[model samples]
Target: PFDYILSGGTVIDGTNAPGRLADVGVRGDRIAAVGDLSASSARRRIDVAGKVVSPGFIDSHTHDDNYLLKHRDMTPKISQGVTTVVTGNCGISLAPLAHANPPAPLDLLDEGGSFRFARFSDYLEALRAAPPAVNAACMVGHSTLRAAVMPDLRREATADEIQAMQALADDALASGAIGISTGAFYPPAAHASTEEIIEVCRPLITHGGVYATHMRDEGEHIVQALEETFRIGRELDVPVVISHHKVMGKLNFGRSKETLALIEAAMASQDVSLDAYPYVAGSTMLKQDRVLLAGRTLITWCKPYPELSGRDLEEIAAERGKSKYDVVPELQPAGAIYFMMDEPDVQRILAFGPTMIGSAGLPHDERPHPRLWGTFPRVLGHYSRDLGLFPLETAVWKMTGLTAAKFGLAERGQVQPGYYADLVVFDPATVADSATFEHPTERAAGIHSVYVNGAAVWEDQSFTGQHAGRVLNR
Candidate 1:
């Protein structure tokens, strides 16, 4: 009668509500029923007794843009119960890329995850052709747009360049992009002035889309960067999401309270929000070692070990024969593993009323961030239940319902009869992150099963290998 029936699990439902014992029935790509499903029978029946059934987590930011292209399986995200991801944050996206590579100034090497396309429509066209396992949506990137319209680098766009970029943004939205993304600190994007950013973002305002930003700084100058971004969002009357919000070092630790204050201040008058990965530390590419290759630097020798992703710079420095201060620049833009947050700040952000969880994972990195492999469980296992930093309901709501509401994925975040059947089943007490920076690729523990479009994607710690995701656009 049903494709599957998961009986005896306590359902969290992603609405921040208390759990209830119930049976869930799935048919095709949607949930057929919840509650009394005792009469239902299916090809498979999962005994979820004492486990929790909830909507799969939504990672609002990541660099899986290209990884999904090479590997459509999306095991990294799916294994952790992430059913949807919005890539193309921070002025980078794989779509709307040029068939011919970008020019020299628009260098792809330093650009991280961005790609060149002939037009925005071409990028959207690429997605329909090969969809990844997790739902995907991209914001038209500021740098990508600038590189397309003005090959000559200038700080402020000429009026003509502005008009051309506006047209591109318009076309991108028409092509089904959710909105515009900007990174004022990055290379080509650094050339754009506030007015230039406003001009490009105006089209999204008119088109009913959102603006997500990688504020100029996630470290020392974060307050100013976030304040400026907030100003832009309020000025344009669009919801603003600060990607991977964090206080990246001792200098910036404990600054999260100020950052939260600023965001709350903006929210009082405008629609402003943010997302962060669960770890106090963070990870990025290691090739950037060249920028600071001289000393003992923190580095991971690529996977089989995820714990190495969380080591401190001092320890990394000792290994590489360099000092922490000397290692800073080289790690920028290249992939790295840096522990930059204060424990208090991390706890504060996690417990903050407005914050949501975003893995910001780069799927292809050999030494990936542990958050990539363990963020969802870390929240449930380490922070919420183990330490009681925040209520379990609060954490669930932040990761699921809050993210869905903020990002405009209206139906996917909730688990209801009519909602999309992207779900996760896990044991609460045993749920823990198995991957450490040292052993990075191991799957997480306690996630018993997962589904996408009613397809059994993961079961009992093994992936069923289903490609059930679609791109989300408002």
Candidate 2:
């Protein structure tokens, strides 16, 4: 008998295939069959008559490395039908190696400071012991390497440092990490030069991995930043993906065309790709708020602890006699938000060559980006149902197959007989993202059930209360 049977549903496998009625049979952790299997007895049968049955989303960009450790049953990602998360993006994460003394530059997230490991495998060992609710594949951060070796250096890495970093990256990849990630836009990562990134990434390419980047600049120098990412891929011979692709400030608004063109050009010549969260505004560290808002102080406006959790900075600035830019620090003395892209831009980019929706969710925020809680549904319900940007098939592929491919997971992104049974069943009509800037923790609507490797993790809009996730290396 099968473990479970999702009987009678419109199966929209993540492979960009046309929807069809089917009964998905699940055994232990793999799809036992995909056609008519009602007669094949099962222990349990979920009645999913009208919902869309599909593969659970594989989120490529996430910032929940620490949050998952604290809240192992990751409710934020589970309810949205997301079964696996590719975290440690943007050059920050506690990791595959151990460190004796954690450095400050690794303080990208306010909660978890720097990350260190004696051997890359040890990091994976820690993750295995703490095994959370979703599968995670990590990318080694260059900034973490710099923090481990240099501690604090405003200058570039010397030859010795480069070799050490490369060796560390090689070991991490061999241990299970997929590739290298760099955050040149942030402090310590910003300190490294193009040559340093190229040097560390060379070994990643040799190991058959991907190199992801959150460019040196997301605003003014957007074009050049993309070019540099492509350059790293060309020089290192690894697939390159731009994390959370969007313009970050007023200066770069409506620059999607230029950005998309550059990406297209890059993909035409090199193996390059990009991922986008389903939101206009993005979130970052509270300390980032302090740096971006030079006019006002975070302590003055956003402070005294939890005063402005869900409040808008634009509204708060007026109350405090300051500009929006100045009010940023007030809302988050240590946090910042850049309202750069709009709905139109989001639509345009979704229509281009290919795209993946990442939550870029901030598990550390009191007033986190709504994307954290609302991304998946917003794509299926808000953007597809509300805006009509792309068909259901295209959106599904973007969230699943495309994202799975960007990383190197071949069998987990789709719903086939041989594929892993990580799936979601939801009413496409009602599956809308409900979390707003005001209600960050609100669960999504219409996601009736979610399964991780054939084990139900979420049911009837409530957590099933299980930790079925594993640390996926490939």
Candidate 3:
């Protein structure tokens, strides 16, 4: 007998293998059996004759640090079949945060009121007290550590400052943080030298933690940035994950062939992994000079000018009778979606054997990028099924098994015996993203059901409000 039985579904298994018809039995929170379970008795049974059953998708990159606490339901993620999320990417985390007002990109994670946790343990404690609907894996942010230890962020950290930051990182890891992430591209961490970053991440090697980075530059200086990322991983002897891998800027378009080649060559000697969203446009802090160069920009959020949300930069500029470059500084502390990256580059990176899929969604944005609501289904339907970019099996693996392995998530990301019964049942043929740039908050089309720790959180197109999510730590 089992707690639940899913009968007669084609199992994709999250292993990048071909699908096979099977019955899966779940007992408590783990899979009890994977095949020939027809004779099994269960408290409840579901018939999924034409559905595709696969391991629930894992969001490889996210900024759901504070959102996990504020919005425990997490419909944006669970609706897309994401069972787990890796938070604290791009060097911003909620806890070990003491500042009243944190810097730019870090502020993108949350406002001042949200940074209440002074220690990493406090943040973890909060999650346990009021867990979200989806599981989470956390990484300590280098920029957060810098703000905690140093008074000024505009310049490079002094040797003593690095030591102070290292202590905080070590404390985070000791308290169950899975790894450390750096957003050297952001203002708070822009001046961080390679040596400073290496020293700060030195504890990861001993703790078997990953070193994930939003490299210093992703456009013209990408080659140099890759070298620096590889150097840090090699020097510290820890796995490195390049977060939201992309070749931005029109001049740097079609440069993924070069970047992917570099990543492949590094993988030969050192451990390297990367995650990317399906869209060509990327979102981040609104730097007028930067977005102006992209040719088009959509404002996601603006603190000073609340009414400007969802408007185009050029549109705002026109209303103000000023150039975008002049209006950008006035908008101060805003977010935008820059229409960058060539389609060929995006496709090339998605097809790369080792790359994983991550939405990189900013949950707090007023009008977020479509990727926030539509990334997973966009890949599964638009890219995989419609465009034939890759088979659905491969797509599932990128969002599940491959991501789980890279993040060292045990007993999850697979539909095998002894694994956690975190699953998604969907109609592959009808699975597609309904969210567009115009209506970005719409739900995905074909996800029929989702389970986390064996509890059905999404069924019959409604959330069951099951707080089965747990904080996955190293």
Candidate 4:
């Protein structure tokens, strides 16, 4: 007897294989069988005759460290058929902080009393006590380390400060952080030298972890940023993940061809991987220099002014009788969606070199980017199935098997016997993202069921209030 049996579905196993008609059986929290299970008995049998059963999608990049603790249900990610999320991207995690108040992009994670973890292990303990609905693989933040040791972030770290940051990073790795991430683009760690970054990542070499970075610049200096990122990985002997790979700004359009060529050459020498969202517009903390506003721009969130959510920056400037440049300073510590990348550039990066899909969503924003709720479905239904960017199997592999392998998530991304039964069942024809910039919180169209660790967290487009998630330790 088995726990459950999903019978008669076209199984698109996560290894980029062709779909086959098979029955998948689950015993406890792992898959028990994958072939002919018609005669197998189980307590419950669901008929999924024409649906597609693939490994539950893994969100490759995110900032859900605080979201998992505050909003334990995780409706935004689970509703899109995502079973796992990689948190602590862009160098802003919620743990190992000595300061109650953080800097600009660091505050992007949370504000006020939300940052309570004095040690990285304390954060892990909180997750074990109250786990979220989906599994989380965490990374220690470089900016968080700076906040712990340095009183001022505008200057470079001294030798003693770098050593102090290294100790905290070592402790985080000991407490099961999958890797370390840096956001040199942010102000807090903007002064970090190449040598300082390599030293802080020294703990990863012995711990067998990866190095993920939101490089120093993504616009005109992207090539130099890539070189610095590659240099750290090459020197430290750790795999590198270029978070949310994109060529920013209209002037820098079509640079992905050059950037990807560099990435390919690095891959031949060392292990390098990247993830990108399925949208042209990118969202982050509002900075005057970062926001080009060449096409359209909308404020996602604002701290000093709350009435600016979902409003265009240009219109707000016009109404206030001020230039957009002057209005930007008023909205300090805010976030916005910049329509900067070309559609062709986004497609090229999406199709280049074993790329994975990440939402890069900010959950705390008042009017969050639609990618927060619509990334996976948009990629599957709109890009893969509807637009014919690639076959459905290929898309599944990017989010599932390929992502799991790159992150060293063992036994959680494939549909085989003895693998964790993290799966999704959906109608291929109708699985479309309904969330837009105007109505950004709407649920997806056709995600029927989602399972994490063989437990149904979402069924028939409704949450079951089941928290089956665990903290994954590399």
lDDT of 3 by residue, 113-181 (tens): 788789999999999999999999999999999988888888888999999999989998998899999
lDDT of 1 by residue, 1-474 (tens): 888888888888888888889988889988888997887778777788999999888888777766666677788878788888887777776555563444322232223435655787776666668876778866778777787778685568999999988888888888888888987766567668888888888987777888998877677677788778978987889888888787775566678888888888788888888888777666554433232232333554323345554455567556868766555444443345655566788788878888898887766565566777888888888898899877777788887888888988867888799888989888888887787766777788888888887887777566676777777787
lDDT of 2 at 273: 85
TM-score of 2: 0.91
lDDT for model 4 = 0.90
Q: What are the root-mean-square deviations of the candidates from the true structure over C-alphas?
A: 4.3, 3.1, 1.1, 1.1
| Candidate 3 global Cα RMSD | 1.1
User: Once superposed on the true structure, which residue ranges of model 2 sit more than 4 Å away at CA?
Assistant: 96-105, 108-118, 286-333
lDDT of 2 by residue, 1-474 (tens): 998899989998888988899999999999999878878999988789998998998888888766777788888999888999987788876764355434433443445333545666776787789877788888788877777667456888989989988888888888888888998887677779999889887877667888988888877788888878888888998898899888665556688888898898778888988888877666665443332443322221133456665555556678899876554444444454545557667677766757788888867665566788889988998888788788887788888888888898868988899898889898988889999765777899989989998888998677777788888866
Candidate 1: regions farther than 4 A off: 40-44, 99-116, 285-333
Error of 1 at 375 (Å): 1.3
Question: TM-scores of all models?
Answer: 0.88, 0.91, 0.98, 0.98
State candidate 1's TM-score: 0.88
Q: Give RMSD (Å) of candidate 4 vs. truth.
A: 1.1
lDDT of 4 by residue, 1-474 (tens): 889999888899999988899989999899999988988889988898889999999998999999999988899999999999999988888988856667778777785677889999999999989989999999999988988889888888999999999999999999999999999998888888999989998999999889998999998999999999999999999999999999988879999999999999999999899999999998888877644565588898888888888899989978988777677888887888888888899999998858999999999888988999999999999999989998999988999999999999999889999999999998888999999988998999989899999999999688899999999976
Judging by lDDT, tell me the better candidate of 1 and 2. 2
